[PDB]
Amino acid sequence: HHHHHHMVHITLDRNTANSWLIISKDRRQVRMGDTHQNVSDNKERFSNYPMVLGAQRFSSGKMYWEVDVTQKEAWDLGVCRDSVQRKGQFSLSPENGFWTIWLWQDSYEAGTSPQTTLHIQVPPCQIGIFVDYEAGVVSFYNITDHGSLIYTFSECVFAGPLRPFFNVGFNYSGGNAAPLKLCPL
Ligand SMILES: CN1CCCc2ccc(S(N)(=O)=O)cc21
Ligand SMILES: CN1CCCc2ccc(S(N)(=O)=O)cc21
Protein backbone atom coordinates (compact mmCIF):
# COMPACT_ATOMS: atom_id res chain seq x y z
CA HIS A 1 0.00 0.00 0.00
CA HIS A 2 1.06 3.66 -0.70
CA HIS A 3 -1.34 5.05 2.04
CA HIS A 4 1.52 6.22 4.44
CA HIS A 5 1.34 9.92 3.14
CA HIS A 6 -2.25 10.33 4.63
CA MET A 7 -0.61 9.65 8.04
CA VAL A 8 -2.36 11.48 10.95
CA HIS A 9 -1.13 11.98 14.58
CA ILE A 10 -3.65 10.15 16.80
CA THR A 11 -3.88 10.74 20.56
CA LEU A 12 -6.08 8.90 23.08
CA ASP A 13 -9.03 10.60 24.82
CA ARG A 14 -8.70 9.85 28.62
CA ASN A 15 -12.37 10.80 29.20
CA THR A 16 -13.60 7.89 27.00
CA ALA A 17 -11.35 5.26 28.60
CA ASN A 18 -12.59 2.36 30.73
CA SER A 19 -11.70 3.26 34.33
CA TRP A 20 -9.03 0.47 34.54
CA LEU A 21 -6.94 1.81 31.65
CA ILE A 22 -3.61 3.60 32.09
CA ILE A 23 -2.83 6.09 29.28
CA SER A 24 0.70 7.47 29.00
CA LYS A 25 1.53 11.18 29.49
CA ASP A 26 1.98 11.64 25.68
CA ARG A 27 -1.52 10.02 25.15
CA ARG A 28 0.07 7.59 22.65
CA GLN A 29 0.11 4.34 24.72
CA VAL A 30 -2.54 2.48 26.75
CA ARG A 31 -2.52 -0.65 28.89
CA MET A 32 -4.78 -2.53 31.32
CA GLY A 33 -4.14 -1.68 34.97
CA ASP A 34 -4.53 -4.33 37.69
CA THR A 35 -7.32 -2.18 39.39
CA HIS A 36 -9.64 0.90 38.99
CA GLN A 37 -7.38 3.87 38.15
CA ASN A 38 -9.06 6.36 40.57
CA VAL A 39 -11.00 8.45 37.98
CA SER A 40 -14.65 9.69 38.26
CA ASP A 41 -17.28 7.94 36.07
CA ASN A 42 -18.92 9.79 33.16
CA LYS A 43 -21.34 8.98 30.33
CA GLU A 44 -18.46 8.67 27.76
CA ARG A 45 -16.50 5.83 29.45
CA PHE A 46 -16.74 2.31 28.03
CA SER A 47 -17.99 0.41 31.16
CA ASN A 48 -17.87 -3.33 30.23
CA TYR A 49 -14.65 -3.67 28.16
CA PRO A 50 -11.09 -2.21 28.19
CA MET A 51 -11.87 0.25 25.35
CA VAL A 52 -10.83 3.87 24.59
CA LEU A 53 -11.29 6.27 21.65
CA GLY A 54 -8.87 8.58 19.83
CA ALA A 55 -9.50 12.32 20.41
CA GLN A 56 -9.58 13.03 16.67
CA ARG A 57 -12.92 13.07 14.76
CA PHE A 58 -13.00 12.47 10.99
CA SER A 59 -15.92 13.40 8.66
CA SER A 60 -14.06 13.64 5.26
CA GLY A 61 -10.83 12.68 3.47
CA LYS A 62 -8.26 9.93 3.78
CA MET A 63 -6.54 9.08 7.11
CA TYR A 64 -3.86 6.50 8.04
CA TRP A 65 -2.26 5.48 11.37
CA GLU A 66 -0.30 2.53 12.81
CA VAL A 67 -0.63 0.63 16.10
CA ASP A 68 1.94 -1.65 17.81
CA VAL A 69 0.41 -4.89 19.17
CA THR A 70 3.71 -6.69 20.08
CA GLN A 71 3.26 -9.75 22.39
CA LYS A 72 -0.47 -9.23 23.01
CA GLU A 73 -2.83 -12.23 23.10
CA ALA A 74 -6.06 -10.22 22.55
CA TRP A 75 -7.05 -6.75 21.22
CA ASP A 76 -9.56 -5.00 18.93
CA LEU A 77 -8.59 -2.13 16.53
CA GLY A 78 -10.32 0.05 13.98
CA VAL A 79 -12.76 3.01 13.86
CA CYS A 80 -16.22 3.66 15.17
CA ARG A 81 -19.00 6.22 15.07
CA ASP A 82 -18.72 9.02 17.63
CA SER A 83 -22.21 7.97 18.89
CA VAL A 84 -21.55 4.23 19.61
CA GLN A 85 -23.04 2.79 22.82
CA ARG A 86 -20.61 3.10 25.82
CA LYS A 87 -22.52 1.19 28.59
CA GLY A 88 -23.43 -2.50 28.89
CA GLN A 89 -22.82 -5.43 26.54
CA PHE A 90 -22.68 -5.06 22.73
CA SER A 91 -21.20 -6.69 19.60
CA LEU A 92 -18.55 -5.06 17.39
CA SER A 93 -20.36 -4.80 14.02
CA PRO A 94 -21.06 -2.18 11.34
CA GLU A 95 -24.75 -2.29 12.45
CA ASN A 96 -23.58 -1.04 15.91
CA GLY A 97 -21.20 1.56 14.32
CA PHE A 98 -17.84 -0.30 14.46
CA TRP A 99 -15.34 -1.23 11.66
CA THR A 100 -12.78 -3.40 13.46
CA ILE A 101 -10.52 -6.48 13.43
CA TRP A 102 -9.29 -8.43 16.42
CA LEU A 103 -6.99 -11.13 17.78
CA TRP A 104 -8.66 -13.66 20.13
CA GLN A 105 -7.54 -17.22 21.10
CA ASP A 106 -4.82 -17.49 18.46
CA SER A 107 -7.09 -16.41 15.52
CA TYR A 108 -7.66 -13.10 13.74
CA GLU A 109 -11.25 -12.08 12.76
CA ALA A 110 -12.97 -9.07 11.13
CA GLY A 111 -15.91 -7.60 13.11
CA THR A 112 -18.66 -8.31 10.54
CA SER A 113 -21.97 -9.86 11.73
CA PRO A 114 -21.31 -12.69 11.92
CA GLN A 115 -17.49 -12.36 12.21
CA THR A 116 -15.16 -13.24 9.31
CA THR A 117 -12.03 -15.46 9.60
CA LEU A 118 -8.83 -13.63 8.54
CA HIS A 119 -5.86 -15.45 6.88
CA ILE A 120 -2.58 -13.98 8.20
CA GLN A 121 0.63 -16.03 7.59
CA VAL A 122 2.94 -13.59 9.52
CA PRO A 123 1.47 -12.65 12.97
CA PRO A 124 1.57 -8.84 12.96
CA CYS A 125 3.49 -6.75 15.49
CA GLN A 126 2.20 -3.47 13.90
CA ILE A 127 -1.16 -2.87 12.12
CA GLY A 128 -1.87 -0.03 9.64
CA ILE A 129 -5.44 1.39 9.54
CA PHE A 130 -6.61 3.32 6.46
CA VAL A 131 -9.95 5.20 6.25
CA ASP A 132 -11.33 6.75 3.04
CA TYR A 133 -14.44 8.61 4.25
CA GLU A 134 -15.77 9.54 0.81
CA ALA A 135 -15.24 6.05 -0.66
CA GLY A 136 -16.76 4.28 2.43
CA VAL A 137 -13.59 2.13 2.98
CA VAL A 138 -11.73 0.92 6.09
CA SER A 139 -8.66 -1.23 5.37
CA PHE A 140 -6.12 -2.97 7.60
CA TYR A 141 -2.48 -3.72 6.66
CA ASN A 142 0.20 -6.02 8.16
CA ILE A 143 3.25 -3.69 8.62
CA THR A 144 5.38 -6.71 9.82
CA ASP A 145 4.74 -8.40 6.39
CA HIS A 146 5.69 -5.55 3.96
CA GLY A 147 2.25 -3.87 4.32
CA SER A 148 0.21 -6.88 3.05
CA LEU A 149 -3.60 -6.46 3.09
CA ILE A 150 -5.44 -8.03 6.07
CA TYR A 151 -9.03 -6.91 5.42
CA THR A 152 -11.14 -4.24 3.63
CA PHE A 153 -14.63 -3.14 4.72
CA SER A 154 -16.23 -1.53 1.66
CA GLU A 155 -19.67 0.02 1.10
CA CYS A 156 -19.35 1.37 4.67
CA VAL A 157 -22.33 3.42 5.94
CA PHE A 158 -20.44 5.55 8.56
CA ALA A 159 -23.57 7.67 9.32
CA GLY A 160 -21.57 10.06 11.54
CA PRO A 161 -18.14 11.38 12.45
CA LEU A 162 -15.54 8.60 13.00
CA ARG A 163 -13.12 8.14 15.90
CA PRO A 164 -10.10 5.81 16.17
CA PHE A 165 -11.13 2.79 18.30
CA PHE A 166 -8.94 0.62 20.61
CA ASN A 167 -9.48 -2.35 22.95
CA VAL A 168 -6.39 -3.55 24.92
CA GLY A 169 -8.32 -6.75 25.90
CA PHE A 170 -8.74 -8.39 29.29
CA ASN A 171 -5.79 -9.96 31.08
CA TYR A 172 -7.36 -13.04 32.74
CA SER A 173 -4.37 -15.20 31.48
CA GLY A 174 -1.57 -12.97 32.80
CA GLY A 175 -0.19 -13.01 29.21
CA ASN A 176 -1.98 -9.91 27.82
CA ALA A 177 -0.62 -7.01 29.99
CA ALA A 178 1.37 -5.40 27.15
CA PRO A 179 0.23 -1.98 25.84
CA LEU A 180 -1.21 -0.79 22.54
CA LYS A 181 1.12 1.95 21.20
CA LEU A 182 0.53 4.51 18.43
CA CYS A 183 3.63 4.27 16.18
CA PRO A 184 5.49 7.40 15.07
CA LEU A 185 5.12 8.79 11.51
C1 LIG B 1 -14.29 -8.17 19.66
N1 LIG B 1 -14.13 -9.55 20.11
C2 LIG B 1 -12.85 -9.88 20.74
C3 LIG B 1 -12.52 -11.31 20.61
C4 LIG B 1 -13.65 -12.28 20.85
C5 LIG B 1 -14.96 -11.83 20.27
C6 LIG B 1 -16.01 -12.72 20.09
C7 LIG B 1 -17.23 -12.30 19.58
C8 LIG B 1 -17.40 -10.96 19.25
S1 LIG B 1 -18.93 -10.37 18.59
N2 LIG B 1 -19.00 -10.84 17.06
O1 LIG B 1 -20.00 -11.02 19.28
O2 LIG B 1 -18.86 -8.94 18.59
C9 LIG B 1 -16.38 -10.05 19.43
C10 LIG B 1 -15.14 -10.46 19.95
C1 LIG C 1 -16.31 -6.68 22.64
N1 LIG C 1 -16.48 -8.06 23.09
C2 LIG C 1 -17.86 -8.57 23.09
C3 LIG C 1 -17.96 -9.94 23.67
C4 LIG C 1 -16.85 -10.84 23.18
C5 LIG C 1 -15.52 -10.23 23.53
C6 LIG C 1 -14.43 -10.99 23.94
C7 LIG C 1 -13.22 -10.40 24.27
C8 LIG C 1 -13.09 -9.00 24.19
S1 LIG C 1 -11.56 -8.21 24.62
N2 LIG C 1 -10.75 -7.82 23.29
O1 LIG C 1 -11.94 -7.00 25.29
O2 LIG C 1 -10.76 -9.15 25.35
C9 LIG C 1 -14.17 -8.23 23.81
C10 LIG C 1 -15.39 -8.82 23.47
Side-chain angles (χ1 to χ4, degrees), residues 1-184:
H1 76 92
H2 300 304
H3 294 315
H4 306 112
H5 60 98
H6 300 294
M7 176 78 78
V8 291
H9 185 81
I10 299 308
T11 60
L12 299 173
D13 180 351
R14 301 187 164 283
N15 286 338
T16 69
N18 176 276
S19 62
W20 287 46
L21 296 183
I22 301 170
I23 291 168
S24 63
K25 183 156 59 190
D26 68 1
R27 298 191 299 113
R28 300 273 284 167
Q29 313 190 15
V30 57
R31 67 185 178 89
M32 190 55 163
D34 282 329
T35 191
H36 187 293
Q37 294 304 129
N38 205 29
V39 293
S40 60
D41 208 358
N42 70 48
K43 63 177 187 189
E44 301 181 69
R45 296 197 185 288
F46 287 100
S47 60
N48 287 48
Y49 311 103
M51 293 166 179
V52 60
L53 303 185
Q56 290 71 36
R57 286 45 152 13
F58 302 123
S59 287
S60 68
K62 291 176 179 184
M63 287 71 54
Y64 178 78
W65 62 100
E66 292 176 356
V67 183
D68 195 299
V69 297
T70 299
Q71 68 125 156
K72 290 190 67 57
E73 297 177 342
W75 49 260
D76 318 325
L77 288 173
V79 292
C80 63
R81 296 196 187 126
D82 62 352
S83 59
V84 294
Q85 176 186 345
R86 306 305 170 84
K87 306 302 181 182
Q89 290 198 104
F90 55 88
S91 297
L92 298 179
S93 63
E95 305 99 271
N96 288 340
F98 298 91
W99 296 266
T100 63
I101 68 169
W102 61 78
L103 172 62
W104 181 255
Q105 299 188 166
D106 201 35
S107 73
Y108 298 91
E109 297 176 322
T112 54
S113 182
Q115 65 261 74
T116 301
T117 296
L118 301 174
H119 302 95
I120 312 185
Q121 178 61 16
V122 177
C125 297
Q126 299 90 34
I127 302 287
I129 302 178
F130 176 68
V131 180
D132 182 339
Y133 199 100
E134 274 65 37
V137 168
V138 184
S139 293
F140 298 83
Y141 297 93
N142 183 344
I143 304 315
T144 306
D145 183 42
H146 310 280
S148 55
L149 182 66
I150 296 170
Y151 192 81
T152 291
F153 290 91
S154 71
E155 313 190 284
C156 297
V157 179
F158 297 133
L162 292 174
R163 297 183 68 178
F165 174 78
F166 309 86
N167 187 351
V168 298
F170 293 102
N171 188 27
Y172 292 112
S173 65
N176 199 34
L180 295 174
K181 309 185 187 173
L182 282 153
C183 306

